[model samples]
Target: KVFGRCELAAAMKRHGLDNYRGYSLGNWVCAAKFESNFNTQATNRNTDGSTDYGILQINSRWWCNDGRTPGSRNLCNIPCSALLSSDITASVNCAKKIVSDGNGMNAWVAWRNRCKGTDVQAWIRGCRL
Candidate 1:
């Protein structure tokens, strides 16, 4: 799946979660924003590089080619069902894994390094874990 930083960042802010981050937050609520504004029904055009498909805008072409069916929950090499179900936190957790190079939190740290000015890790101080 192709990752879109802009959309992800927007989702983070819209949900009052974190901005351009990799941690998962149960209190967030940006899935609807993405599903509706980004791609209604979670579908995208085959020709367009943007608007891939599904929860995290997975590249529709890659999805079909790899194994996961379009609009289907789970089976995307990462089992990213959270996005399909409109669960922002679940989607973020999956994202954490994907962005972390399979290590999850490590990816968040890397992102934090590049985005220190944005203080993308603002929520870290508050999370109990």
Candidate 2:
């Protein structure tokens, strides 16, 4: 795990992701918690056989290549494992692509299911930005 709420806020600020493309900091914070619990190395499989990797739970079906997983479009042109690190630059960049690609934060099931239509200000309430 690379961050708690405050640490994540600081890091995201440093990466220019505090609030990018109309998404709030709370949206990212809430999604990150549900997706990976702040663990950079988190990974899980979808019932469709694709794996989600990292804090944002990026899927192998589109964003990254896992080598073992075929049919990936690899739009992000990164290794799935690259997302499993304390450095979140690639993950954030790819997420930007996903958002601009028209999904917005809806690409993350966590964001859609948990963060949307929910009060998320407390996700960063005490975090000093």
Candidate 3:
């Protein structure tokens, strides 16, 4: 499932990503925009042989186990398949764990390169929440 900007914004906010770990709602929205373009099934294989999965593109190297990444920590303790589902519950929860683990939103390079230090209010401008 691919989400419209406002739809993704509302979903992330509902999942408690708004101001999560001192990052603003717009920051999360901006990160998702660049990471996966709001596509729930997005995946990318890294040059190091690890894969990124789902909307937030949680990495197999540390967050989810894809049975391919060497020495994966599987810190989220979920199969990579769970991150691809349209439900997004697992994806959001994993993202929360990532931030809480001290990685912050910068865990996703898209956030560091595009969303960080910018005025991201426009990312959620039309969203009610």
Candidate 4:
């Protein structure tokens, strides 16, 4: 599923991403934009053989077990396939775990390069969140 910009913002906010671990809803939306463009099924394979999945692009190396990452921790305790679902509940839950684990939003390189320290408010502008 490909979400509209404000649609994703509202969804993330409903999932408690707003101000999650000090990262605002806009930060999350901005990262999702750069990471997967709001597509629920987005996936990317890393040079190290790890794979990123879903809107947040959670990684197989540390977050999910894709059965092929070699050293996957499966810290989210979910199959990597779960991230592909359009519902996003599992993705949001796992993301919360990732942030609470002290990785912060900086865990995503897309967020670091594109959203960090920037005025991300535009990502959620007019979303009424």
Candidate 5:
């Protein structure tokens, strides 16, 4: 489910995310690595019975609907399942909204736990950006 690193970077740029909210491509790459191992179809069930979706691992608790999960704010207005698709447009758009709401990469716990302040250069080391 992993998209090529350079390809992913290019897509993010085309989506107007190259330097969104002061977040660099490298930071995005690094966060994706730790979030879902770059797996577009990845999903994780949390202890609270909530789920994370797609490469960004967006929370079912706030961004999308998973039917049984309660308190989902559905800020993205799309089903949680949609984010698991190979097409990342929805996921990309939702992630931008998340950051625009002032969360930045902090909306992703993996970014806070693993990618924040880390050496992110390798995430774009060979990308032709």
Candidate 6:
């Protein structure tokens, strides 16, 4: 059930961000790589020894804690079955909050340092993956 490029662009739009062409696609790529190796079905075991199921590595416990939680509709805003979707879309949507409001990529920047060299912003901008 891979979303088409157009579908993904539309989805990104819902998050107050755009991803058509000639734009910020670098960090988005890097985020997916670090989050799930581009595996839309990946899950995290959690820092507290619990679990976070789905792509975007949506933690079962820290869903809202991460701010990717959609909000109100899903209680803690955990996107049910979200792990089964593209991590890039999820992360990018989630990133809008962090990027526009927060001072950084929220708590998701760890993925960059681990996967791609966190040497410089250009590094993230020029990541091969």
Which sequence of candidate numbers ranks them by TM-score, best first? 3, 4, 2, 5, 6, 1
TM-score of each: 0.32, 0.95, 0.96, 0.96, 0.93, 0.50
In candidate 3, stretches whose alpha carbon ends up further than 4 angstroms from where it belongs are none
Error of 6 at 109 (Å): 4.2
Ranking by lDDT: 4, 3, 2, 5, 6, 1
Which candidate gets the maximum lDDT versus the true structure?
Answer: 4
Q: Residue by residue across 39-109, what tens digits does model 5's lDDT show?
A: 89999999988999998899888889889787667889999989988888999999999988876788788
Please identify model 5 stretches exceeding 4 Å from their true place. none
> Per-residue lDDT of 88-110 in model 6, one digit per residue for the tens?
55545544444554344444655
lDDT per model, in order?
0.40, 0.87, 0.90, 0.90, 0.85, 0.47
Stretches of candidate 4 exceeding 4 Å from the true structure? none
The sequence of per-residue lDDT tens digits that candidate 4 reaches over residues 1-129 is 999999888888888889988888889889999999999999999999999999999999998999998866899999999999989999999999988876687788889899888999888878776
Model 3 lDDT per residue over 1-129, tens place: 999999988988898999989988999888888989999999999988999999999999998888888877899999999999989899999998999887787788999999888999989986887
lDDT of 4: 0.90
Off by over 4 Å in 2: none
Among residues 3 or more apart in sequence or in different chains, the pairs in candidate 6 whose N, CA or C atoms overlap within 3 Å are 52-59, 52-60, 54-83, 55-83
